[PDB]
């Protein structure tokens, strides 16, 4: 399921990763340890997106960029992970552009085929109660149990 009439240009800019859910234990625990991270979304040369995330380690702001390649309909992408020998489908399931986006990622090829993750993006570092509830309900609809749902603190 993809956001109808998806406007990629309105999805650009600064977002904060405010929650996630996944069937991968270690990803949930690590992302929890990192806290909310800033993401910057910019158009890529191939018509898709560059997603640049930053996180703090020790005295340092580390930068990571993921190329989300267009996968055939607006709002859906594919991400190739050389380190994990795998390719993943990434969809913007729902967004209002100015406050939130709900994303869903699953493995599509390689050993990470089984992987699944729901992600909450907010335009601010303090998502409102109603958006946290939306996200919990989104995760539940995607089969994630409440124990796999994690809100990332600022």
Swiss-Prot record:
Q: Which residues are glycosylated?
A: 1, 23, 50
Report which reactions are catalysed by this protein. prostaglandin H2 = prostaglandin D2
Coarsely, its chief localization is endoplasmic reticulum
Top-level EC class as recorded in UniProt: isomerase
Could you give a single Gene Ontology term from the biological process aspect? regulation of circadian sleep/wake cycle, sleep
Outcome after substituting residue 55 to A? Reduces enzyme activity about five-fold
Reported tissue expression: Abundant in the brain and CNS, where it is expressed in tissues of the blood-brain barrier and secreted into the cerebro-spinal fluid. Abundantly expressed in the heart. In the male reproductive system, it is expressed in the testis, epididymis and prostate, and is secreted into the seminal fluid. Expressed in the eye and secreted into the aqueous humor. Lower levels detected in various tissue fluids such as serum, normal urine, ascitic fluid and tear fluid. Also found in a number of other organs including ovary, fimbriae of the fallopian tubes, kidney, leukocytes.
Keywords, comma-separated and alphabetical: Cytoplasm, Disulfide bond, Endoplasmic reticulum, Fatty acid biosynthesis, Fatty acid metabolism, Glycoprotein, Golgi apparatus, Isomerase, Lipid biosynthesis, Lipid metabolism, Mast cell degranulation, Membrane, Nucleus, Prostaglandin biosynthesis, Prostaglandin metabolism, Secreted, Signal, Transport
Query: Could you confirm whether the keyword Glycoprotein appears in this record?
Result: yes
One GO molecular function term of this record is: fatty acid binding
What does its record list under induction? By IL1B/interleukin-1 beta and thyroid hormone. Probably induced by dexamethasone, dihydrotestosterone (DHT), progesterone, retinoic acid and retinal. Repressed by the Notch-Hes signaling pathway.
Q: Which GO terms describe its cellular component?
A: endoplasmic reticulum membrane; extracellular exosome; extracellular region; extracellular space; Golgi apparatus; nuclear membrane; perinuclear region of cytoplasm; rough endoplasmic reticulum
Q: Give its localization.
A: Rough endoplasmic reticulum; Nucleus membrane; Golgi apparatus; Cytoplasm, Perinuclear region
E.C. number(s) listed in UniProt: 5.3.99.2
Q: How is it modified after translation?
A: N- and O-glycosylated. Both N-glycosylation recognition sites are almost quantitatively occupied by N-glycans of the biantennary complex type, with a considerable proportion of structures bearing a bisecting GlcNAc. N-glycan at Asn-50: dHex1Hex5HexNAc4. Agalacto structure as well as sialylated and nonsialylated oligosaccharides bearing alpha2-3- and/or alpha2-6-linked NeuNAc are present.
Changing residue 36 to A has the effect of:
Reduces enzyme activity almost ten-fold
* Active-site residues, Swiss-Prot/TrEMBL: 37 (nucleophile)
Q: What is the effect of changing residue 37 to A?
A: Loss of enzyme activity
Q: State the family named in the UniProt similarity comment for this chain.
A: Belongs to the calycin superfamily. Lipocalin family.
The record's misc note reads: It has been proposed that the urinary and serum levels may provide a sensitive indicator of renal damage in diabetes mellitus and hypertension. Elevated levels in the coronary circulation may also be associated with angina. Changes in charge and molecular weight microheterogeneity, due to modification of the N-linked oligosaccharides, may be associated with neurodegenerative disease and multiple sclerosis. Detected in meningioma but not in other brain tumors and may be considered a specific cell marker for meningioma. Expression levels in amniotic fluid are altered in abnormal pregnancies.
The record's function comment reads:
Catalyzes the conversion of PGH2 to PGD2, a prostaglandin involved in smooth muscle contraction/relaxation and a potent inhibitor of platelet aggregation. Involved in a variety of CNS functions, such as sedation, NREM sleep and PGE2-induced allodynia, and may have an anti-apoptotic role in oligodendrocytes. Binds small non-substrate lipophilic molecules, including biliverdin, bilirubin, retinal, retinoic acid and thyroid hormone, and may act as a scavenger for harmful hydrophobic molecules and as a secretory retinoid and thyroid hormone transporter.
What is the UniProt domain comment for this protein? Forms a beta-barrel structure that accommodates hydrophobic ligands in its interior.
On subunit structure and binding partners, the annotation says: Monomer.
Q: What is this protein called?
A: Prostaglandin-H2 D-isomerase
Protein species of origin? Homo sapiens
């Amino acid at each position: 399921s993809v956001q109808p009439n998806f406007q990629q240009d309105k999805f650009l800019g600064r977002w904060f990763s405010a929650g996630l859910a996944s069937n991968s234990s270690w990803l949930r625990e690590k992302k929890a340890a990192l806290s909310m991270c800033k993401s910057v979304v910019a158009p890529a040369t191939d018509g898709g997106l560059n997603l640049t995330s930053t996180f703090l380690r020790k005295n340092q702001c580390e930068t990571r960029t993921m190329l989300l390649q267009p996968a055939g309909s607006l709002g859906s992408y594919s991400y190739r992970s050389p380190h994990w020998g795998s390719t993943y489908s990434v969809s913007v399931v729902e967004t209002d552009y100015d406050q939130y986006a709900l994303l869903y990622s699953q493995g599509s090829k390689g050993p990470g085929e089984d992987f699944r993750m729901a992600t909450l993006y907010s335009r601010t570092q303090t998502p409102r109660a109603e958006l946290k509830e939306k996200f919990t309900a989104f995760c539940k609809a995607q089969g994630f149990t409440e124990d796999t749902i994690v809100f990332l603190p600022q």
